[PDB]
Amino acid sequence: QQKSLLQQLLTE
Amino acid sequence: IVYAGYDKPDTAENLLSTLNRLAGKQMIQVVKWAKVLPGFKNLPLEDQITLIQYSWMSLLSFALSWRSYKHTNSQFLYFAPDLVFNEEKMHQSAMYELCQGMHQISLQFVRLQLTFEEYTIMKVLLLLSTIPKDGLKSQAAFEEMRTNYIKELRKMVTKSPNNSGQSWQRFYQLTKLLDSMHDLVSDLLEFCFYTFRESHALKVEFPAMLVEIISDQLPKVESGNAKPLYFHR
Ligand SMILES: CNC(=O)C[C@H]1COc2cc(F)c(CC(C)C)cc2N1C(=O)c1ccc2c(c1)NC(=O)CO2
Ligand SMILES: [Cl-]
């Protein structure tokens, strides 16, 4: 469920 | 420009913790750079993540070589404005060897008089230098992107009047330098995987960005699910 920091930065 | 915040006794453990904290902050910049790169931006999210997780160390090593070249004429490794040193400061054999290896790459930038334009395209090629053993989700899209950047570098080098009489030899020296990054980077990653696994015992700290990347990268590398791409091998 919780997104990695890499996924967060790529999708923000 | 990311600062190291270099404090505390000068120990290998403390230097590595400082470098890891710095690497995590540099990685926020690398992801922002990758996100808007033509072609990459189009790859599926799982592939974008896969590529960054395999090549993060290569991207940081290449940027370190560029900083070292621009700020010190490759006499020292310019980690940050407040953290500049070379292999001569290293007492531990492995750490001396890794610094010396990084120093030799940065010296190739002096040998070639590498331009910012060459550096920019070469950095993209490093992001696209390792894939899974069975390929990516969008393997065809990736292959087209990688071919396009190789052609962009080749055209830039061969068309430049600064390279007249030796442009094809220069292009092959640049692609040999990219291949040589695989060897150095494998060695840096072996050291990194060791301090990561022995973090508590060695007292080597890692920021959340690196804990997350290494936790996903390490099982891939350990299982042999990592295919390095070479120009000459
Ligand atoms: C902020 N990083 C950068 O600017 C450059 C990056 C990439 O190229 C480097 C080259 C280099 F010679 C050294 C010096 C070390 C080997 C004493 C470090 C790094 N870099 C690392 O981040 C790094 C590498 C291996 C590690 C670690 C960190 N942490 C560990 O715990 C051990 O393995
Ligand atoms: Cl953190």
Side-chain angles (χ1 to χ4, degrees):
Chain A
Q1 188 248 288
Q2 191 178 351
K3 282 152 59 137
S4 68
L5 288 160
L6 179 53
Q7 186 168 334
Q8 284 169 48
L9 293 168
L10 286 163
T11 61
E12 67 174 38
Chain B
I1 296 155
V2 194
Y3 282 79
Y6 197 54
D7 203 356
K8 276 179 184 176
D10 207 313
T11 66
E13 312 83 79
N14 291 332
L15 173 56
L16 295 175
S17 296
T18 298
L19 287 172
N20 294 341
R21 203 132 46 237
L22 177 59
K25 285 173 194 168
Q26 290 175 352
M27 280 309 303
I28 308 172
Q29 304 194 328
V30 165
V31 179
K32 291 179 181 173
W33 160 84
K35 199 182 176 178
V36 301
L37 224 38
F40 186 84
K41 55 181 183 180
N42 293 148
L43 287 171
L45 180 60
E46 64 198 277
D47 288 347
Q48 293 181 1
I49 293 170
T50 294
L51 289 168
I52 292 168
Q53 292 178 335
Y54 281 134
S55 296
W56 73 276
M57 188 68 81
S58 196
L59 293 169
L60 297 188
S61 183
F62 205 65
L64 171 61
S65 185
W66 182 255
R67 290 192 307 273
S68 301
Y69 165 61
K70 294 312 289 177
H71 292 278
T72 78
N73 288 62
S74 304
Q75 288 198 311
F76 301 95
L77 301 179
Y78 192 96
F79 291 95
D82 57 343
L83 187 56
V84 184
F85 62 89
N86 61 26
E87 63 272 22
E88 303 199 325
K89 292 293 270 181
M90 303 291 98
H91 310 283
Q92 204 271 304
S93 189
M95 287 173 83
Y96 178 100
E97 281 172 20
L98 295 171
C99 289
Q100 204 280 334
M102 183 76 262
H103 191 177
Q104 293 304 126
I105 294 291
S106 71
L107 286 166
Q108 306 308 312
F109 281 29
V110 177
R111 184 179 280 271
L112 290 158
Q113 292 294 291
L114 193 70
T115 71
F116 184 63
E117 295 69 28
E118 285 165 341
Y119 165 75
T120 294
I121 303 175
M122 287 168 82
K123 201 164 88 94
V124 177
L125 289 178
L126 291 176
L127 172 63
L128 308 175
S129 64
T130 300
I131 59 170
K133 189 194 176 181
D134 295 316
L136 295 157
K137 193 207 174 185
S138 211
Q139 187 60 33
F142 164 86
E143 282 183 20
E144 285 169 38
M145 182 183 169
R146 188 167 182 267
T147 300
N148 285 170
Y149 281 101
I150 295 163
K151 282 184 183 181
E152 201 173 324
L153 181 59
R154 185 178 45 79
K155 288 167 182 155
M156 162 191 282
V157 173
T158 60
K159 287 172 181 292
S160 169
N162 302 122
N163 306 327
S164 304
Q166 53 194 223
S167 71
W168 279 94
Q169 285 189 148
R170 180 184 185 82
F171 176 67
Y172 292 125
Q173 284 303 117
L174 298 182
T175 58
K176 267 284 177 188
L177 179 53
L178 289 175
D179 285 356
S180 78
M181 289 298 291
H182 280 306
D183 305 314
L184 174 63
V185 176
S186 179
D187 290 349
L188 291 171
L189 284 169
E190 283 311 302
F191 189 39
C192 196
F193 296 149
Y194 174 67
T195 65
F196 182 75
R197 286 249 171 90
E198 300 300 326
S199 282
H200 307 143
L202 300 181
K203 289 175 181 183
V204 173
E205 299 172 341
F206 285 82
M209 175 66 66
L210 296 197
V211 171
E212 286 180 351
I213 288 169
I214 302 160
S215 300
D216 279 0
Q217 178 195 17
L218 193 38
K220 291 180 191 193
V221 169
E222 285 185 307
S223 60
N225 182 12
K227 189 182 166 182
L229 305 177
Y230 296 95
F231 291 92
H232 307 284
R233 301 170 208 186

